[PDB]
């Protein structure tokens, strides 16, 4: 639609709704005697302007898909954004006064327990990634009018994952994307590095493809025009600003990067702005276009079961590519992203069958995660990224806040432990168990053979939270009849006799280790049972019990990961205390190096002669 | 000193190492099967000007103070770097043809086993940030007049934490710093995002505040004129090249990344790469003037013992700042590290006190902890780096690097758990427990009163490895004598009777939860044992089953983090399958919310009241 040219009326309207903003920010964060009330103070004229003139958004429903998106990533402004919502009539406004309270849900942070929140933010430089998400959503997926503006600091510029996000928009042309940088000179100690100097922020952008615009941050004239020309690039709106913007004696000043003003000064300083602002009257928000498309919400069924016969050879990681693939015939929803390791981790498979549906990450894993967070918001899509798992480490903290997001994302990392061999420990996930069990609300899938591997890429997709599949580099054989039915939290044996003298717990690799170790000890009439958990977090804990006290209440766990956070440490919290119960671990003890696989499983105590040894061990 | 304009026949004698360099990453990668020829081919000129023009460094001793610094940043090169190393007569010649193999030492990627070798690289974006740490340590701390150069891949600058490095080199003015990027337009699976846009890379790195020059990188006159201008800004040389150059049929060709040529393929490319080598006379390295001061080696004692008081309220993050600026006046070779949070860390302190040993690193977590990294190479520093705990999640890949690389850095993370309050998850440290306890070569600290995190302090900069100490923002009592003894792997019990049923386990503010819980227990005549763990690992194992031995083998811990991978899973793998002995763990079971301190310690089932209830639950 055209630009509606504000009239001076307007311009002093949105003047009175930033110094509303400010009030209310001062006010919230006084009453709770923490907070960021200068923060909140520089982005007022930016918040006002957006969500009072540029945006169109239902003030009554959030969450509409058809909403132009908003990211703070600047999260600890929260108070600022609360307050528009009250503003535009969606929260009461009394509630802004018990922010930060255990009896409300205006915390320190946005969460998406509130309604106008998609994902937490707190930990700055990941907004933006979030946000391009959105856009690349709204431009190719949902193929929709909404627009997506995203509000960062410029100590928070400092992040590379911002730079990642700004490199991403422009690779993908993401002209439906504004990022407003709040250049108000200072971070949480000292001025940012690049204080004022507003032409070398000019400079970064351009740099990395966007349209720039300098603007006065605090004229609400400046601020409509910039947002009031769409381009054809991502644009950035860099905003010079002051911190404390309209407190007395605080403007600009250091030392109060979140303090709160004490409240005989909030009372002198709100009487100051109160009496800046001409008139009541609030300006009402300004409804979308509603063409986003309806999305289907059903369970994703694979088309058949799997394939694979029982003996054939196949590596889980080409397992998860042609799984995905297959996947991705039977729901549009299915995207796939991964990080330029395509080839080895085989989500080129799916490439090739869903293009349209693909999106290269480039080597960038911190924004590839966000970037699949942002389509997931609203559930839009339903994502798989994909990368070796050594390098999910890399994204540690943009998982931990997908889980404060509670995004519903699925991750794939291939080239587990020290079966890779010849690569050497830089590319050797042996974290990869213990980082992702930590993550709150996460299954994590350990496959053990193709079959496993397409039950898990299937049950991943209809399981909200944080999904982990951990592929592996070996061709191993197929274990599993392809009708076996497997369930989150449900262990299978796969060894099992009347005399079986300890419960040997593998996954993948460590699993066919076992059941070789199996046939080793037949040879001496020494029995074990073999158990594959298939998840590791939840823990099939009744099967483990069950099956330990029907070996002596011996169990041995074997896994291609360290000792401290993985399936040995999941399976001793689960038994600790049971009668009779004695577990033994067998992991990698201290950084590897690079070999021949079955070497390195050899060297690192995990191979079947490690186990058979355990085992003769135990008995004796 | 002057550059040494080369001759005709120098620049030819740098032609034919380049040759051989590629015949050599050919022969070593074909016999072993895996390698990635077409990486270092790109790289080869680039290599032999370094190591036979531009670089001083003695042959014969790689790790000399006195060196110039080189970083593969791009580790998969490594065989090229073999290569020149055995060109200078460092390396046995047919040692090269045992790379990747169990037998060698020449890895699939550098690791600090080699002498040649400072910082493990492989997991891409990493090593220009070691190589500031280095350059900073020779400008600032050694004053000295060796450089350092920097191999970067193109697709590897796409990582974020590249630009946090090129943003920090500028900011120090790290004018002996050299970045060479390979830009030979291709990735692992595709061309990277800007191919041959040679004018987009020298604007990205302008805009950084890099001096950049664009020159052929397969020229050595334009490698040795590029390298031989000193700057007055930190030098970005944009190398435009061709993957696998130099390998008819493969030169600038997709599908060969990581790919070793057949055996019948090498013999031919071999013998035509050989036809062009002109002369066979080595060129020999230029030692480097040996200006580095002495660095001594000794422990590092603190002044005096602790001066708190039995009864005095400080919480363990003032302490921290405290110990740590305290520690600064026993020795020059401590530095500390902050990322914009030095207000609330309080490493301000340590700024305050020793001004020129502080290095600000800005909101940038990653690239902070690979300047921890360089500064502590070849023993320069012993560096601490702090901010909230939370945050190291944003660093997990350098500081899982780190431990690749053998590294004795010290990390301080403030701000542990729910009880920091009202700012709400995203500043809560809830899996730091996990993510330090899964680096092999961790030791993890976490004191529970200012006496302990002094010791812990000292004892930290002592230890070598990956040290972490886990500070805590409310204030609590001092409990510890400040004449207490502290050592690694020993816990301490705080309270003991003859009577205790059983031992609870605490540390931080749950240890104080727990002192608590056992006063409103003695009220019903119930004591229970208290133990303060120190150090989380190691664990004192044998204090705790001695303990537990003593309180009918019951054992509950309770932890502000969350169930997998901290303190009860700890202890819990420590004692599984003892006999008598149980543990039952409290802690942080979901992604929590903003409310007061103690209101969340409820909410979160980890205040003293939980305790006792669970106390009583086990006796009964
Ligand atoms: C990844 C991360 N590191 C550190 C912090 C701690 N922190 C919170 S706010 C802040 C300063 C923010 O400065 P800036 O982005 O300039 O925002 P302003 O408040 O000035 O708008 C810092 C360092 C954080 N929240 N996230
Ligand atoms: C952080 C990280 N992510 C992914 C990988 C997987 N990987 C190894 S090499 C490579 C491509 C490297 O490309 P480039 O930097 O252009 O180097 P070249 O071999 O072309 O010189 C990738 C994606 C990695 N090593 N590290
Ligand atoms: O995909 P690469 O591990 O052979
Ligand atoms: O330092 P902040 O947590 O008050
Ligand atoms: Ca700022
Ligand atoms: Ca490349």
Redesign the interface.
């Known amino acids: 639609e055209s630009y509606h040219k504000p009239d001076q009326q307007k311009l002093q309207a949105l003047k009175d709704t930033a110094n509303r903003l400010r009030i209310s920010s001062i006010q919230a964060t006084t009453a ?4 960021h009330p200068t923060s909140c103070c520089s982005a007022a004229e930016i918040m006002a302007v957006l969500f009072f003139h540029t945006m169109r958004y239902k003030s009554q429903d959030p969450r509409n898909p058809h909403n132009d998106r908003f990211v703070l990533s600047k ?1 600890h402004a929260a108070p600022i954004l609360y307050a528009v919502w009250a503003e535009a009539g969606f929260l009461a406004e009394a509630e802004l006064l018990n922010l ?3 009896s ?1 849900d205006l ?3 946005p ?1 998406p327990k509130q309604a106008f929140t998609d994902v ?6 990941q907004g933006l990634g979030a946000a391009c998400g959105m856009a690349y959503t709204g431009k190719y997926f949902d193929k929709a009018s909404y627009r997506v503006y995203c509000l960062l600091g410029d ?2 510029l ?7 996000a700004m ?1 991403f928009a422009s ?1 993908y042309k993401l002209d439906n994307l504004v990022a407003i940088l709040d250049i108000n000179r200072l ?4 001025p ?2 690049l204080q004022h100097q507003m032409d ?1 922020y000019q ?2 952008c ?3 493809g966007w349209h720039a615009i300098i603007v006065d941050g605090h004229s609400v004239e400046e601020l409509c025009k910039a947002f009031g020309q769409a381009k054809h690039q991502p644009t950035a709106i860099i905003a010079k600003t002051f911190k404390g913007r309209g407190i007395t004696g605080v403007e600009d000043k250091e030392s109060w ?1 979140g303090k709160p003003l004490p409240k005989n000064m909030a009372e002198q300083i709100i009487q100051e702005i109160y009496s800046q602002i001409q008139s009541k009257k609030k300006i009402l928000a300004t409804p979308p276009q509603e063409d986003a498309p309806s999305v289907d919400i059903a369970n994703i069924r694979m088309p058949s079961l799997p394939s694979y016969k029982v003996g054939d050879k196949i590596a889980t990681r080409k397992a998860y590519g042609q799984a995905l693939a297959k996947l991705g015939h039977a729901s549009d929803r299915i995207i796939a992203l ?1 990080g ?5 981790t085989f989500s ?1 498979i799916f490439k090739k069958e869903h293009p349209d549906r693909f999106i ?1 990450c ?3 894993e ?2 590839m995660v966000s970037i699949a967070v942002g389509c997931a918001t609203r559930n839009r899509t339903v994502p798989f990224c994909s990368t070796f798992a ?2 999910f ?2 994204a ?2 943009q998982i ?2 997908a ?2 997001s ?1 995004s519903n994302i699925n991750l794939c990392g291939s080239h587990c432990g020290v079966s890779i ?7 050797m996930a ?2 990869d168990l ?2 992702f ?5 996460s299954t994590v899938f350990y496959p053990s053979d193709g079959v496993a591997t397409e039950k898990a890429v299937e049950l991943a997709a209809n399981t909200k939270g944080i999904c982990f599949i951990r592929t592996s580099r070996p061709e191993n054989a197929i274990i599993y009849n392809n009708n076996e039915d497997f369930q989150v939290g449900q262990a299978k044996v796969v060894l099992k006799s009347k005399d079986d003298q300890v419960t040997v717990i593998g996954a993948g690799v460590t699993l066919h280790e076992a059941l070789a170790a199996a046939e080793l000890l037949k040879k001496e009439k020494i029995n074990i049972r073999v158990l594959d958990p298939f998840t590791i ?1 939840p823990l099939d804990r009744k099967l483990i019990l069950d099956s330990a006290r029907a070996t002596k209440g011996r169990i041995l766990t074997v896994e291609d990961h ?4 993985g399936i ?3 399976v ?2 689960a ?3 049971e009668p009779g ?5 067998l992991a990698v ?3 590897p ?4 696989p079955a ?2 499983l050899k ?1 690192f105590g995990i191979d079947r002669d490690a186990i058979a040894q355990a085992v003769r061990g135990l008995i004796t």
Do not use: C
Request: no cysteine; aromatic share 6%.
């Open positions: 709770a005697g923490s907070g999260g930060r309270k255990i409300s915390d320190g942070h969460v937490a933010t707190g930990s700055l430089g100590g928070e400092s992040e590379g994952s911002v730079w990642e490199a690779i971070g949480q100690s000292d940012a590095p070398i400079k970064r351009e740099a990395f990067h991964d330029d390791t395509k080839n080895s080129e290269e480039y080597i960038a911190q924004n050594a390098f480490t890399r540690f903290d931990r806040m889980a404060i509670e061999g010849e690569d050497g420990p830089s590319q042996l974290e213990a980082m069990r930590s993550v709150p609300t977090k360290y000792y401290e956070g040995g440490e999941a001793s919290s038994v600790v205390g119960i004695t577990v033994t671990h003890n201290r950084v190096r690079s070999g021949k070497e390195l060297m």
